[model samples]
Target chain A: GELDLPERNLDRRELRDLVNELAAHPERWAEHVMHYASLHRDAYVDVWLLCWRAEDDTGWHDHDISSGAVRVVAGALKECNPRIGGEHLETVVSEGESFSFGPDHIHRLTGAVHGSVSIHAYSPPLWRLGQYSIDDSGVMRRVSVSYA
Target chain B: GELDLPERNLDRRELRDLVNELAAHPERWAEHVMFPHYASLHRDAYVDVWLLCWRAEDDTGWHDHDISSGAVRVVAGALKECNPRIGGEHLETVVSEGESFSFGPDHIHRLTGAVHGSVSIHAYSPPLWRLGQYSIDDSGVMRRVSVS
Candidate 1:
């Protein structure tokens, strides 16, 4: 009722189909290491393109103050959410599929089961990221980052 | 009786109306901006989108996004996608009418026009910021230029 910009959100159907269609196209693919970058940025959100190689992994991290959506354009990606110590909720997202998280969501992209390229959209451009790790005493610690 | 105005229903109408308007005035649907073979439609904060019209004469140049992820679907006609590689390049595909493709910041490709002419819808998250323009100089050396 009090918003200026048009609703950029698409229905679940739209996203799933869109992601599938996108993945089928032959374009950007990577190997070896992970390739992550921005495609465009306006004001509300930041769009990131990620290419995951074999051992490419992201430790536990959070999109500080940002809501995020991920659509696997090609290949397969495994996401792990730390629900318990060393026993997190794991999900394997395949080509043409997608998943999302809120600002409070904390997760990690462990590795690509098969090589993959994905599109990530973060609402209100992620200005900071929080990386989670455990210390020698098993105490969880957070490291702040400026960019991915 | 009057037509019921459902909440958030106007976007549907707007989409329909925009389609009609664009079809009504094909000439006005797109215009070369910054350079030839380049036509832009709408770009906003929420989700930046544009209408692209390409003729065989002037095709889309090689370019990549800055920090956004987006998709392109053909509205009418056909388009081509060319991905460069070593030894005379690798992938070259034609995007037919009703078909689409997607890309992120790292993906670099070129559309050299369609068999006849082409029209496509390119939408991006957070709209477009700076774009990476790719080109080869007189000496066959490739270069990347930043543009908005």
Candidate 2:
């Protein structure tokens, strides 16, 4: 998904690159392979921790207009962004790294070839989201979700 | 400052325990600095991080953030927390190292210099927007001064 920052906007590409540079060592989770935790949240912002296993993925979705930043805490992660009516670009983020996204950007994520953990900060909290799929009829579809 | 949290009340002791754990991380900042962690460049409602130091020489009068809620984790040394009692006297308590507590938008209290020195990590939602300082006149009346 995406987020608009408060100051002058930052380039998404660089934001992503910056995520990959955040410092983190030693994994943070030991149970629940695809683990999620609410680190903190209030009215305007939310912070969460996501832990992934070798085959875990978030499917495909958009942030529902909330801008977000994700930083890899340990191990690695792969972010796949599907181009509109085009191919997909995959980025591999290592520990101590991060990536940034604007509001409603569509993307999917999977754990690295091994394991991964991430810290996510979003403006306006991630209250609603849109899930995307390729339906059986060869048509793309979007479904809205709440309470996320 | 603001933080999006799970739709549940994290117990005072629970949050204190959490802060103790979080502070154990070598998340060190320069001594005596109000170091903000992972400061967001945008003006979105996102959780803000801070590392603060309090030497015995450090002191602050009564005050409150205009509209922010946050938690403080004491990493080392003893610090004092004071809220106004009737008649403008401060009813004080000691928050020793490893303890944590939350503060909201209400004009309630103040924190002062550490017994020796202290280190703390602070998390706030929506970043600070305004500040209100409190003072007591010789007549025992309380007055608030606002700041951006």
Candidate 3:
């Protein structure tokens, strides 16, 4: 049988209520390994889910779309916002903790050494993300990203 | 009321079980953020959670950790994953829902849009993320990232 995709165009309040419902059913959420979910489009906002294992981390990058927040649900993780001179300022965020970042805020995320999970929310969803890297000459460069 | 933080050292199986239990309580999962329920910390596993309001979005970025899989649970709104480019071959993912750009592969993701009160659960266990740079030129120059 062909895969069945659900219909789009959900209501705001209804969607919020649905999130509350899912939060109540952690068992169902875990069983499916479904961590992040949201309704997003070119003209709308977007929500995201993220789960992490030990040493699981996001490299240095920046969001080019809009501002957003990162909320921890199950485990612990760390946020390393970038800084000048190849150094990073780090913050350890545990469960029930949350933080916000904007498009101008370039940073990186690292799961706790022990492991962790979280959820992310954004506006206008995300479109073009700029990846960052340093060359052998110590120069930083950014490029557009597309998921695999 | 005083905030209560859970103890760490839980494993993946344990975390999964905890998430299962939390999922049962819809009322609790709604609202803002919660955590330390439980999760496993293998060699390279991790998890994450996110919530969103209408008009929020994330910038484009990719996982710098090792290779991994991500699962999403749409608790509130909706999200879209766009593909800008793919693999070492430099092939652009032109189709919105092409196989090469589906979930579970290494690709950049950003929130596209959301209605009011949208939320979701996203998990990436055993994340093999590493520092990635955007391609500014064919010669491979890169820019560094600094977080506030």
| Top candidate when judged by TM-score against the true structure | 1
Query: Where is model 1 more than 4 Å wrong at Cα?
Result: A1-34, B1-148
Best by DockQ: 3
Instruction: Rank candidates by lDDT, best first.
Output: 2, 1, 3
- What is the CAPRI rating of model 3's predicted complex? incorrect
The DockQ of each candidate is 0.01, 0.01, 0.02
lDDT of 2 by residue, A1-148 (tens): 2223343333455445433432331233223235687654565666567777798988877665467788887788888876433345678988777778766366788856555778776665678665655534333334446755
Residues B10-38, candidate 1: write the lDDT tens digits: 23234334434444455655444335644
How do the predictions measure up, each by TM-score? Answer: 0.41, 0.41, 0.41
What is the Å distance of residue B126 in model 3 from its true position? Answer: 37
Task: Evaluate candidate 2 and give its CAPRI docking class based on DockQ.
Answer: incorrect
Q: State each model's TM-score restricted to chain B.
A: 0.67, 0.70, 0.44
User: Candidate 1 recovers what fraction of true contacts?
Assistant: 0.00
RMSD to the native, candidate 2? Answer: 21.9
Residue-wise C-alpha lDDT for candidate 3, range A66-113, written one tens digit per residue:
466676766788888654333456788887777665445567788565
Q: In candidate 2, how many Å is residue B123 off? A: 45
lDDT of 1 at A100: 67
TM-score of 2: 0.41
